[PDB]
Amino acid sequence: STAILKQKNRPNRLIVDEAINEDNSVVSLSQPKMDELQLFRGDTVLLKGKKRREAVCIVLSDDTCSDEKIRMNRVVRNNLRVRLGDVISIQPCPDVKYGKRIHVLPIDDTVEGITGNLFEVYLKPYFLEAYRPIRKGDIFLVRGGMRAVEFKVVETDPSPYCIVAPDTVIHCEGEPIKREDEEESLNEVGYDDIGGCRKQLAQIKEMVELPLRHPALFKAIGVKPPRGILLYGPPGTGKTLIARAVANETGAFFFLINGPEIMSKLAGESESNLRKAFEEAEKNAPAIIFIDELDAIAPGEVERRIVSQLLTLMDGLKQRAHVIVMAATNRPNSIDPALRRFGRFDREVDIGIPDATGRLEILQIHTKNMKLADDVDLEQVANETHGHVGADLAALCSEAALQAIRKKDETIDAEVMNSLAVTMDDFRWALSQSNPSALRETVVEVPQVTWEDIGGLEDVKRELQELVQKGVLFYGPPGCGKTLLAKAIANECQANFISIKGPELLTMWFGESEANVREIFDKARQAAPCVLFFDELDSIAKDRVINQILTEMDGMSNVFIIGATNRPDIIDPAILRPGRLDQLIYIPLPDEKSRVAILKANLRKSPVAKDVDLEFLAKMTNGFSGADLTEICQRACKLAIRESIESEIRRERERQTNPSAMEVEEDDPVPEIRRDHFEEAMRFARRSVSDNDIRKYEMFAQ
Template sequence: MVSSFLLQLDGLEVVDQPVLVIGATSSPSSLDPSLRRFGRFDREVDLGVPDEAGRLDILRIHTRKMHLTKDVSLEDIAKETHGFVGADISQLTLEAALQAIRDSGVEATERSSSGVVVSAAHFQSALKACHPSSLREMVVQVPNVTWETIGGLQHVKMELQELVQFPVEHPEKYEAFGMEPSRGVLFYGPPGCGKTLMAKAVANECQSNFISVKGPELLNAYFGESEANVRMVFERARAAAPCVLFFDELDSIAVMRGQGKDSHGAMDRVINQLLTEIDGVGKRKNVFVIGATNRPDIIDTALMRPGRLDQLIYIPMPDLGSRLAILQAAFKRAALASDIDLPYLAECLDGYTGADITEICQRAAKLAIKQNIGEEVAKRKGDFDGEPVQQILALHLESAVRTSRKSVSEEDLAMYQSFAAKMRKMQEETALGASASPITRFSFKNKGK
C-alpha cells in the first residue's frame, strides 16, 4: 500500500497541471519515514492545541448566539480549559446550554435553547463532564487532593511549590528574571510514604492536567513498540499543557544502561527515547515530569543530569508530627471515642509508613462498622438492648494496631537514608565546587576595599 502510494505521489512531478497533496495525521511519528522525505510530504505544519488566547477566541465564536449571565467570564473559562481543542470547546458550550435547558424545565429543542440563559454554574457543571480529547484515552481522574489532604511533609511541599507551582502560576516572572524553570523532579524513598499522592496534589494545586503512567505499562514485547509508547505519552502531555506527567515505578524502565536482562538492548532503547523526550519538552511547552521510584540506586544517572530530572526529593518516613497529621487526616470525617489519644498513638507508630498508618485507621473503622451492624441485627432480634456503637472505640484501634505490621524493614530504611545522605553531599559539592569553600562575608559594598 505504501509503495503504491509513493509511486503515485512521485508521478505527480510529470503532470502538466500542478497538484498539491495535503495529508493530515494526529500521530506523525507513526508514519512511514519515506513519506516525510524531500519531494513528498516535506513541509509539516503543526496545528497544535490552542493556547489561552486561542481558546478565548473559540469560546467567543461558540457563545455569540447564547444568552449569558453577567457572572460568566469567558476569560476564566479559557484559563480552566487547558488541553481543549476546538471540538472540545464546542462540546463544552453545548453541554453548558443543555444543562441550562434541564434547569429551566423546557424541552431541549433548537428553538427553546436560543432563549435559555446560561450561567457560570452551568459552565462549571459542563467542565466536570467534558475532558480534553487529547487525554481521553489516558486521563486520570485526580481526586480532590490538596496540600492539606496530605499529612506532614511540610519541607517537601514547600520545595515542590517552588519547583512546580511557581513556574506554572507565575511564568512571566521567570521570563522577566531570565530563569528557565526545572523540567522535572525525581521522588524517591520507601514505598507507602506518599509519592503518588504528592504528585496528584501538585497537579491539583497548579490547576494542571495530570497524566499518570506506570513504567511497566509502557513495555511491549514487539520491537520498537515500547519506544513508541514513550513518544505517545509525551505527545499527549505536550498537547495537554500545562500538564504534570507522572511516571510511577520509574525504575522498571530506567535501569542503568547495559545492566538490563534483555539480550537485544530493548531497555536501553527505552531509556534513550525517554531522555530524548525529556530534552525535547522545552520551557515553552509547560510540561513538568515527575518520576517516582523505590530503587533510586539503579536509576540511570543520565536521567538525573541537569535539565532532566535534576531535582531529587527524598520522601522520608513520617516523623512524629507527620504521623499525627496523617491520623488526623484519616479520621477527619470519623467519629472517635473521647478516650482515644491520637498524639500517643502517633508516638507508638514510629517506623510505620503513611500507607501503613492509613491501613490501621481503615481497619479500625471496619471493625467499628462490623460491630455496629452486628448490634443492630441483634437488637432487632431482641438479643441486644443497648444502643449500637456509633463511634470508633479505643478497642477497635488497639486491635487494628496489634494486627498491623511495618512494610519497610530496618535494612531497607538504612539503604534509603544512606542514598539520601549521599545525594545531599553530592549536591553540596556541586554547588560549592570540588575544592571551593563558601564566601561567608560576601557583599557588593566591599567592592574596591
C-alpha cells in the same frame, strides 16, 4: 474454435479457490458439481493445469463452495503450478494403480538441526492406511516437533502417479535434496498464514488481485486500479505479513523499503535508493513495493527532498508499469495529506487489534506444528488473551512451546521433539510469566488533591511551593505520599495530571522497543499545561528505552515531568543530569507528629472514643507508611461497625419477647472507635522496609 472446448468441457472447467481442508491430498467441490461428474465423496480425481503438470487428489463435498469453483490448498496449487483464480481441468479417475514401491526424500533446509529417523516420525503415520494419491515431483509437508518438514517425491511405481497401499514399499534411501527455483517455499508467506482478518484481505484482493495477476485483461475491463494503498494499525498486526502474502499469491515481485533504514543513509544516497527500488520493481513487474513505517518519511531541506522524490516516483507510475505501492503506518493522520490524495494512495485498509474470534485463528495458525495436549482449549485462551496483535500471540505460542521443551545437545532428537506435547499449563505459564499491564488505558485527569490533604512533609511542601508560583524525582519508602505530592502540584499549578507506571512504556514480553514512549509525551502535549508523572521509574528495567525518553524530554520546554521510585539505586543517573531534572526530593516515613496529622485527617470522618490517644497511635505505629496509616483507620471502622451491628442485631432479636415496650430514657447505643479496635486492626499485613534501606535513601544524594 476456442469457445467449443470451453463450452464442451465446461463441466470440467473450474477455477481455483482457497480451501477449508488443510490436508495435502484433499480438494473440495460443490455437491451439484460432485453429482454432475458422478463423483463419490472420497473418490479420486485428476487435475491438470496450463503448465501441463498433473496432480491426483481426493475429492470432498463443500457446501460453501461455488459450482464453477474448485478449492485446493497451498500444497496442491504448487504441485499443479497454479494459483488462486487460475483455470484447471478435472476428471474422475477410478483406475489408479496401488503403488508397488515409491521413492521419497526430504528437503535440506527443513531438516536442519535434528537427528533421528524421519520415516518412523513423519512419513510412517502419514502414509499408514491413508490410501493417499501420490504423483511424481509432488512436494508435500508433514507437521510435528515444532516443525514443518517438506518431502519430495522422486519416483513412483507405476508412474507418473499411484496411490500408497499398506503393501506399497516406501523407499527413503538417499540424501536430502536441494531446493528448486520453480517450487516456491511453503515456508514462504501465504493467505493461510494470515489469521484474524479475512475481511481486510478480501478488500485487498478485490483491489490488487486482478491488476497484478493479469493487468492486460484488467486494462480492457476498463476499471481504474489503485496506484497505492495505506495499511494502518498498531505494530505486529500482520501488515508486512499481508503485503508478502498478497504479492506471493498473485505471483508478483516483492520489494521491501524500510522507512527508517532508508532514511539513515546520507543525502543523495537515499534518493538514489528509492529510484533503484522502483526501477527494479518495474523491471520485475508485475510487482509490489512495500514501504514499512511510512511516517518515518513524510509526516529541513533533505526532509522534503526525498518526499518530493517519492511523489514523483508515485505519480511516475502508469498502470502499464504493473506496479502497486503498499505502505504501512500507525494512523493515516500521521502521514502527509499530500500522499493520501487521489491518484497516489486512494484507498486505506484498517488492520486492527483482532477480536476474540480472530485471535483463535491466529493461535490455530501458530500451533499447527506443535502437538497439543488434550486439556488445551485454544478458544478459551483466546478469551483470556487480550489486546494481543498477531506478533504477540505468535510470541505466546513460541514461548509456551519452549516451556515444554524446558523439561529436559545443541541438536535435538526428532522423535522426542515430535512426541513432546504442549499443555494448557504451559500456556497459562507463558501467558503469566512475561507480560504487562500495558494498554493500560492512559487517562488524563485533574486531581482535586491540595496541600492540606497531605499530612506532614512541610519542609518538602515549602520547597515545592517555591519552585513554581525543570523536573523532580521523588524517592523514598512506598506509600509515604510520593504520588499525592505530584497531584498537589498539578492542582496548585492548575494543570492536567497524567499517571503512568514504568512497564506501561514497555510492550508485552517486556519488549525494549517502544513506539508508545513518545505517545505518552504526545498526550502529555495534547493536554496543557500538564504534569507527566512516571510511577516506578525503576520498573523500566524489564538499554534503548532510557535514551529515547531523554530525547523526547528535551525536545519540548509547557509540560512538567515528575519521576517517582521506591528503589532509586538502580535508576540510571543519566536521567538525573541537572539540565533535565534538578530537584531530588526525599520523602521519608511520616514522623511521630506527621502520623498524628495523618491519623486525625482520616478519623475526622467518623466518631472516636474518649480514651483514644492519637499521640499514642503515632507511637504504636511508626514504621507505618501513609498507606498503612490510612488502612489501619479503615480496618478500625470495619471492626467498629461489625461490632455495632452484631450488637444491633442482638437487640432486634431480644425485642421479640416484648415489641410493645418503649423506653424513652433508654437511648440508642452510640458507635465508637476505641483503642482495642486499632489494637486488633494492626494485624493485617505486611510490607515493611528494612532499616538498612533507610540509610541508603538518606545516603542517596551524591
